[PDB]
Amino acid sequence: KNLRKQKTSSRRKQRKAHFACNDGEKRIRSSARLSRELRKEYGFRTFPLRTGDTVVVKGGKFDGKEGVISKINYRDYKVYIEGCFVTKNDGTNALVPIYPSKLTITKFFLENGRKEQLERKKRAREHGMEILRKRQEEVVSN
């Protein structure tokens, strides 16, 4: 019951697939982009997020801050970062939720089997960039 590769271009069907998909698809729609200096080691652009990653905010009142993710809520599209808070009417602090597509990944987390997820996708991309080169260079003759 995955829905993010729908053929339809109907507005009601697309908003329905964003707000009501399963939790597996909520994580891929919560994807972030890598920095320039981290995108020279791995070849790819965006990768999804988890706790422990270091990011940087871009736009809003926390524009320019940097911190570590302390909690994620995939179902509601909410990320909590250490250092972006507010004081309630009691003296206490609370963390503010941010939307995942306004962050940039720098120095992610590599401990619970995540070092291999990055290496599997780095191989699939360079294998796919050669099917395109062989086709292109031969279609160069085409």
Closest residue by Cα to residue 17 from 31, 1, 3: 3
Closest residue by Cα to residue 62 from 107, 103, 105, 106: 103
Least Cβ distance, residue 27 to RNA (angstroms)? 7
Distance (Å, whole) CA 111 – CA 64 = 27
Nearer CB in complex with RNA: 45/137: 45
Least Cβ distance, residue 42 to RNA (angstroms)? 9
Place of tokens 């698809």: 25
Nearer CB in complex with RNA: 75/137: 75
Least Cβ distance, residue 5 to RNA (angstroms)? 4
